[PDB]
């Protein structure tokens, strides 16, 4: 039918209590919604209710120990929240975090429901907190629960999906998603990210392309690390055309989930990349060719309010069926070196890569 959109004001109901300038702030999602409206895109979407994730849903990924400690966050004093946050890497807490995080997960599951039952063609959750760093028993990197990792397993259980592709074009490596599915050949994880031999957060050798998955998961984890700043649309277009999409068509997923971060867009104060927002119209378009176009995007990172709004808008135009834009740009030496090396590491597992 149409394109679903989930957003709730509860997504604005948590923020960093000890820094008023923390980049992961409520104005991220309200600026996206403002631009979607002024551009006429919001009204062309099917509005979809959010819902709170269930514990059984959360237990698809997270431990009962971690869920309960999380649920306890809504009744801790500030000091007890600040003290638990410091036990994690790059994470703040707030009395409303757990509630908004449950709705952040559920927003994705609502879209998976409507897309998997052909009620909608695709959808986009304008959610925070983000998720792709959250791990089975740990907060990490502004994330409490791993939205897409839960959605992937949820789709497999509730909708009898065999194979899920997760595409993570946020500028950071989604190491949480990697770890959850590291041994799992039914969930193919692809991440393109700033890396710089480990100097860029999260500073993990596991973010390099030599991490291809383990055991039965070998070949089903694909990292494309950038080792020079300033990458552009041509770097991402090349990556998608000759690496991800060949592997995707060969994998034949039944659902595609996008960790839709926009911190690689030019102007982001964190990602140090130069991607134009319209590039994501082209990347989104390519993904619509797989899995009968059953495609759900969920907001991850992106910290320039205007650049992230424009990146969401370009993605949305493609979800809605608008013509592909003209791009004023046209890969660098560092980017091609990265793509060759990732292809080399994944060569033995994918015929579509073999030339
Ligand atoms: O986008 C993301 C999550 C990004 C996590 C990055 C952690 C390091 C960092 O930049 N921390 C920071 C702390 C305070 C201020 I003020 C500005 C920045 N995942 O995709
Ligand atoms: K990524
Ligand atoms: K995997
Ligand atoms: Zn990010």
From TrEMBL:
Protein name: Protein deacetylase HDAC6
Residues of the full protein shown: 61 to 417 of 1081
Binding site for Zn(2+) 1: 170, 172, 263
Domain of life from the UniProt record: Eukaryota
Record localization: Cell projection, Axon; Cell projection, Dendrite; Cytoplasm, Cytoskeleton, Cilium basal body; Cytoplasm, Cytoskeleton, Microtubule organizing center, Centrosome
Protein family (similarity comment): Belongs to the histone deacetylase family. HD type 2 subfamily.
């Amino acid at each position: 039918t149409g394109t679903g959109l989930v957003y709730v004001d509860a997504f604005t109901r948590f923020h960093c209590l000890w820094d008023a300038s923390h980049p992961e702030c409520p104005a991220r999602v309200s600026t996206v919604m403002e631009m979607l409206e002024t551009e006429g895109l919001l009204g062309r979407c099917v509005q979809v209710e959010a819902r709170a994730v269930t514990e059984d849903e959360l237990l698809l990924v997270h431990t009962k120990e971690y869920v309960e400690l999380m649920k306890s966050t809504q009744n801790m004093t500030e000091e007890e929240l600040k003290t638990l946050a410091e036990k994690y890497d790059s994470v703040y807490l707030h009395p409303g975090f757990f509630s908004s995080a449950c709705l952040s997960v559920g927003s994705v599951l609502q879209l998976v429901d409507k897309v998997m039952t052909s009620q909608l063609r695709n959808g986009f959750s304008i959610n925070r907190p983000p998720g792709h760093h959250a791990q089975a028993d740990k907060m990490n990197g502004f994330c409490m629960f791993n939205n897409l990792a839960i959605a992937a397993r949820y789709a497999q259980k509730r909708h009898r999906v065999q194979r899920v592709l997760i595409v993570d074009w946020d500028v950071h490596h989604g190491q949480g998603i990697q770890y959850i599915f590291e041994e799992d050949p039914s969930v193919l994880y692809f991440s393109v990210h700033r890396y710089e031999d480990g100097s860029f957060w999260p500073h993990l050798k596991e973010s390099d392309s030599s991490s291809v998955g383990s055991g039965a998961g070998q070949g089903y984890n694909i990292n494309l690390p950038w080792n020079k700043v300033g990458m552009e649309s041509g770097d991402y277009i090349t990556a998608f055309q000759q690496l991800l999409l060949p592997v995707a068509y060969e994998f034949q997923p039944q659902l595609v989930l996008v960790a839709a971060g926009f911190d690689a867009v030019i102007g982001d104060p964190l990602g140090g990349m130069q991607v134009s927002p319209e590039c994501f119209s082209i990347l989104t378009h390519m993904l619509k060719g797989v899995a009968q176009g059953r495609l759900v995007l969920a907001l991850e990172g992106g910290y320039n309010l205007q650049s992230t709004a424009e990146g969401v808008c370009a993605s949305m135009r493609s979800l809605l069926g608008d013509p592909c834009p003209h791009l004023p740009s046209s890969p660098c030496e560092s980017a091609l070196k990265s793509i060759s090396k990732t292809i080399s590491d994944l060569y033995p597992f994918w015929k579509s890569l073999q030339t």
